[PDB]
């Protein structure tokens, strides 16, 4: 279950002053691809320059696969006791009662260390820990009911035009699976309840305009094949796949920020993957480089 590549039993990377040990780097995590633990860590190391700004401050849930994606992996919200103290934790009060300590990935060392701990996919809050109930992202999470990319691509364009028509900045990323997130950056002046009411009301208006096409029906059977305008990530405690996060799918696809024009150049949500994304970055640059400069507020409050 190796692709031997000359690695030592343990490689030590030196990132931002921290020694990060990568044990068994030639262990295969993607069996159809021969993508090893080391190659995954190297992906997160080179992508860190663009990804760190997009995940810093966010409570992060880890989807870890110590034996690769062909075997069972797990979600983990409570930070491991053995993570070094320089890996930031956020202290969160559970609605249950009591507290949870989640990782916050505030720098490249942390990102690389989490990859070395077999994190494949990071999932992050729509808010940052210094104002954890006040999102800086509004997400519409679009998946096609027919598993056809054109279905989600056309919905994403219409939704973008509807938000652009109201005066909002609209950003976009693939999820590296089947879907797209349409994203409005926010200035953190409204709390989640306000943002989510907006998102639901917007979805409701869009549904009334295109009633055979879109739905906000919460029950899957009532949808009757219409695309769900999923506003439900806009709550405290919800996560979305991190921008530049790897999915646990063959080919190692990446949830990639893309421009609206680029949406027509691609063929599907898994267009970019750890092995072809560097060519993309070289040619196109980070589509979300200025996302936070466009941070805005909900109109008519
Ligand atoms: Na939100």
Automatic annotation (TrEMBL):
Q: Which residues form the DNA ligase D polymerase domain?
A: 36-288
InterPro entries per UniProt: LigD_pol_dom, NHEJ_LigD
Species, as recorded: Methanocella paludicola (strain DSM 17711 / JCM 13418 / NBRC 101707 / SANAE)
Protein's UniProt name:
DNA ligase D polymerase domain-containing protein
Q: Could you say which residues form the signal peptide?
A: none
């Amino acid at each position: 279950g190796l692709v031997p590549r000359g690695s030592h039993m343990t490689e030590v990377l030196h990132i931002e002053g921290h020694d990060i040990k990568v044990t068994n780097p030639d262990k295969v995590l993607f069996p159809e691809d021969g993508i090893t633990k080391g190659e995954l860590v190297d992906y997160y190391r080179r992508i860190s320059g663009v990804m760190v700004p997009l995940v810093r401050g966010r409570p992060m849930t880890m989807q870890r696969f110590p034996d690769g994606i062909g075997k069972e992996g797990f979600f983990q919200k409570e930070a491991s006791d053995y993570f070094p103290d320089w890996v930031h934790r956020a202290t969160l009060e559970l609605g249950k009662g009591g507290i949870q300590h989640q990782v916050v990935c505030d720098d490249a060392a942390t990102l690389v260390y989490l990859a070395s701990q077999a994190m494949i996919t990071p999932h992050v809050f729509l808010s940052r820990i210094d104002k954890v109930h006040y999102p800086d992202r509004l997400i519409f999470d679009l998946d096609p009911p027919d598993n056809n990319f054109e279905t989600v691509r056309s919905a994403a364009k219409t939704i973008r035009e509807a938000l652009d028509a109201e005066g909002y900045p609209v950003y976009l990323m693939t999820t590296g699976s089947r879907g797209l997130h349409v994203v409005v950056p926010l200035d953190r002046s409204a709390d989640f309840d306000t943002v989510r009411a907006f998102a639901r009301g917007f979805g409701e208006k869009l549904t009334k305009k295109y009633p055979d096409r879109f739905t906000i029906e919460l029950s899957k059977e009532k949808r009757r094949g219409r695309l769900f305008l999923d506003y439900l990530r806009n709550s405290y405690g919800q996560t979305g796949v991190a921008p530049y996060g790897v999915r646990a799918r063959s080919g190692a696809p990446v949830a990639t920020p893309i421009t609206w024009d680029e949406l027509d150049d691609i063929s599907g949500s898994q267009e970019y993957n750890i092995r072809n994304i560097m060519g993309r970055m070289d040619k196109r640059g980070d589509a979300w480089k200025y996302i936070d400069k466009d941070r805005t507020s909900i109109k008519n409050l």
